[PDB]
Design a protein around this nucleic acid. Structure first.
Ligand SMILES: [Mg+2]
Ligand SMILES: [Mg+2]
Ligand SMILES: [Mg+2]
Ligand SMILES: [Mg+2]
Ligand SMILES: [Mg+2]
Ligand SMILES: [Mg+2]
Ligand SMILES: [Mg+2]
Ligand SMILES: [Mg+2]
Ligand SMILES: [Mg+2]
Ligand SMILES: [Mg+2]
Ligand SMILES: [Mg+2]
Ligand SMILES: [Mg+2]
Ligand SMILES: [Mg+2]
Ligand SMILES: [Mg+2]
Ligand SMILES: [Mg+2]
Ligand SMILES: [Mg+2]
Ligand SMILES: [Mg+2]
Ligand SMILES: [Zn+2]
Ligand SMILES: [Zn+2]
Lengths: 96, 51, 79, 63, 118
RNA sequence: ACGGAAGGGCACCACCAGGAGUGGAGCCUGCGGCUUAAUUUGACUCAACACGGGGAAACUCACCAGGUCCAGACACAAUAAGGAUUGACAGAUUGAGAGCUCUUUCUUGAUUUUGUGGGUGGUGGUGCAUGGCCGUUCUUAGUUGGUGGAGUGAUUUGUCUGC
RNA sequence: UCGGUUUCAAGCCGAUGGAAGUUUGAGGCAAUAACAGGUCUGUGAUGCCCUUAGACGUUCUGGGCCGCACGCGCGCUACACUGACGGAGCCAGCGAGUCUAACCUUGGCCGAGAGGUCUUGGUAAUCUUGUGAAACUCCGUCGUGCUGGGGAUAGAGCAUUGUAAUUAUUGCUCUUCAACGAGGAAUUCCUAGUAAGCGCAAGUCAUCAGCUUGCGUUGAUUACGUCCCUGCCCUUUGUACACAC
């Protein structure tokens, strides 16, 4: 989709850091609550994300929930240059 | 462009929170569910039938 | 003290009312109208046939120092 | 009677910056009045002004 | 907040509904009877009656953690006020809602209808 | 099952006794028809026709006259750092202050463009391919099986004369 | 309970008693077998087909769904003197209502009105609200003829909703003042606080109720029966019907 590499990894962090997304289905919301972009961009990015793997989705009343797989946790190295397994999302953050 | 979503409340703003449906919306107490969608999910929302 | 409590079911609504007139004697010391919310729509999903109507109902019943903070531990609220 | 694409004529990349005597940066065209044209864009020259390349919204700077 | 008890009790059950046909729409394939929402001080405990239950902790913590932060993100709950207690259903042969899902998957693997219904 | 066949029984969606009417008038509103660029459409006995919660100025919007956009995911081949893509002041433009397309020559940085597939959305079609729900038959009392009894059998008795 | 009744019964009828004696009144629930009944125009329910960039996707601008020789279905308002109007008396119940905000609105002024305005209370058994509703009730005016019954049609002006009122959104003011003189053949609904008359809240909803879902106020006439019509149920009967008169 039409979004230069400062956008598709505008979040390459909220994904690996937080772990999941929420986005009520609203193209032209253009201001995601909890994230700095169009709400269109996250979903279309998550589309592009899920349709390659690394992340799943579920729908339940127009709220487009996303979740990522262990396949994600080694794809956030090719252009998401982070130290290998130095950290993850559902690891020791608040109670793990 | 910026002429994309360049128009408005009324029916065009409201929709059932289950199907995106603009029509036949039940909004008394602000639940915002289709009459049809309401009658299915009404069992556990709190509305039982007595009389 | 003064507490106001509410719920939809009545049993565990009145398993605290009694459970508070018994902490009322905790050291040998010191009903609202029910609100029925009516949703009244059609049985049919489309438009066909006998024109049949169907009321639903929610029933809302409401009632009303060291020992204070260990009494609040159904919709619980107090001021 | 169908619609049409965009030509976006590429040119053989940035066409203008001049070497003097092999050499030194001699420069040509104009810059804007912002650090959003912070020496990463020197302004266009189309017709009647030197409008930006990055500041295509505000900042019609002239000299 | 600032809602008359009418409009939030409505929105209490709406929350329960969306929660539920979220849960069913999410983990029917793992076995799931209803959900209990404890309206309790501090936390809002969501006890989940489930048939097969270890489908909630993944890499020893990695699943309910993935869910707890999910329900709050949509419902704007600040972290740690949503406790996802994950119980196990009372006598799973008690729930039509469970067994219907036990058959939806059963027939969805080609087992003859008279076979997998009877 | 049906009978302008018999015996019972029972209903104001039956009559009787009557009320209040409707059918006539004016306007509201729905259906047809005619009309139209389109007058979106579903439903036609009860059980279509102030019914689709259908009280439509925009939205709704499905129709009609036009104008944008991709919100064409992912794979492959292509383009590709000596420019892939994207964008735009003003005018020409146009309902428009819209850079859709042209003039113009600046941006922009592998983000998506060209193509083959392959998706996706679809108030597009089929309620004579379905689910769920609903209406109706049917507001009435009716329906079934185990065992034995009758019959080669389909079937029947049970589920009955009378009250 | 007492009697009358039964045919032993099941019950039915009368009475006294009682807040209550038609299952006490009214509802919710509701079987088996079915219909090619209706709904893909409620679903991010869905098989197959069609479409997918000059799009049937989507958005934006503007029009239409309202368009008027005509037929029909639900209704609203009336032909008046058991009325219209003007003062006056003044009595309900079911409900809904605002903070990632502008809902229900009292009281003070301004305005003939519609409405305008500065406060105000209420997340509501508290406040709006006794919702001072309307029919109705007391007192007057009019005088039988389209009249002061009737308010359709239309002109002119002032307001409100809303980016936007033109093909009047709706409210107000004055003016215009049509058919209609109790509705042919037909035909709907109804047995008690029911029919009908009367208004009110709720759904809708930015604005718009002549609609619907309910609630109370005033409150009758007439049957407490039949199988004539329409028609359901149970036997028995006949059939050349079985896609079933
Ligand atoms: Mg008429
Ligand atoms: Mg019938
Ligand atoms: Mg329109
Ligand atoms: Mg339009
Ligand atoms: Mg469409
Ligand atoms: Mg059908
Ligand atoms: Mg036998
Ligand atoms: Mg038999
Ligand atoms: Mg039945
Ligand atoms: Mg058919
Ligand atoms: Mg479809
Ligand atoms: Mg229409
Ligand atoms: Mg009708
Ligand atoms: Mg008059
Ligand atoms: Mg009077
Ligand atoms: Mg009749
Ligand atoms: Mg209506
Ligand atoms: Zn819905
Ligand atoms: Zn600049």
């Amino acid at each position: 989709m039409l979004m230069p590499k400062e956008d598709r990894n505008k979040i390459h962090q909220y994904l690996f850091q937080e772990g999941v997304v929420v986005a009520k289905k609203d193209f032209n919301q253009a201001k995601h609550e909890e994230i700095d972009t169009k709400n269109l961009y996250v979903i279309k990015a998550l589309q592009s994300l899920t349709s390659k793997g690394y992340v799943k989705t579920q729908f339940s009343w127009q709220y487009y929930y996303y979740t990522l797989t262990e396949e994600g946790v080694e794809y956030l190295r090719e252009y998401l240059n982070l130290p290998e397994h130095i950290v993850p999302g559902t690891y020791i953050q608040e109670r793990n | 462009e910026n002429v994309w979503f360049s128009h408005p409340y009324g029916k065009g703003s409201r929709q059932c929170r289950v199907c995106s449906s603009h029509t036949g919306l039940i909004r008394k107490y602000g639940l915002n569910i289709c009459r049809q969608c309401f009658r299915e999910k009404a069992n556990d929302i709190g509305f039982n039938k007595f009389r | 003290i003064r507490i106001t409590l509410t719920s939809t079911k009545v049993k565990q609504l009145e398993n605290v009312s009694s459970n508070i007139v018994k902490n009322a004697e905790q050291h040998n010391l010191v009903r609202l109208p029910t609100k029925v919310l009516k949703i009244s729509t059609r049985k049919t999903p489309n438009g066909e046939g006998s024109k049949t109507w169907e009321t639903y109902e929610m029933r809302i019943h409401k009632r009303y120092v060291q020992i204070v903070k260990r009494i609040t531990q159904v919709d619980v609220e107090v001021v | 009677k169908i619609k049409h694409k965009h030509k976006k004529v590429k040119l053989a990349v940035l066409s203008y910056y001049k070497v003097d005597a092999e050499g030194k940066v001699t420069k040509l065209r104009r810059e804007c009045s912002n650090p959003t044209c912070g020496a990463g864009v020197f302004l266009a020259n189309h017709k009647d002004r030197l409008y930006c390349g990055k500041c295509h919204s505000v900042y019609k700077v002239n000299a | 907040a600032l809602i008359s008890k009418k409009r939030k009790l409505v929105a209490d059950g709406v929350f329960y509904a969306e929660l539920n046909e979220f849960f069913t729409r999410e983990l029917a394939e793992e076995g799931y009877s209803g959900v209990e929402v404890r309206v309790t001080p501090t936390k809002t405990e969501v006890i989940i009656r489930a048939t097969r239950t270890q489908d909630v902790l993944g890499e020893n913590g990695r699943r309910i953690n993935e869910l707890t932060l999910l329900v709050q993100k949509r419902f704007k709950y600040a972290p740690g006020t949503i406790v996802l207690y994950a119980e196990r259903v009372q006598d799973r042969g008690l729930s039509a809602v469970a067994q219907a899902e036990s058959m939806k998957f059963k027939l969805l693997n080609g087992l003859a209808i008279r076979r997998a219904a009877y």
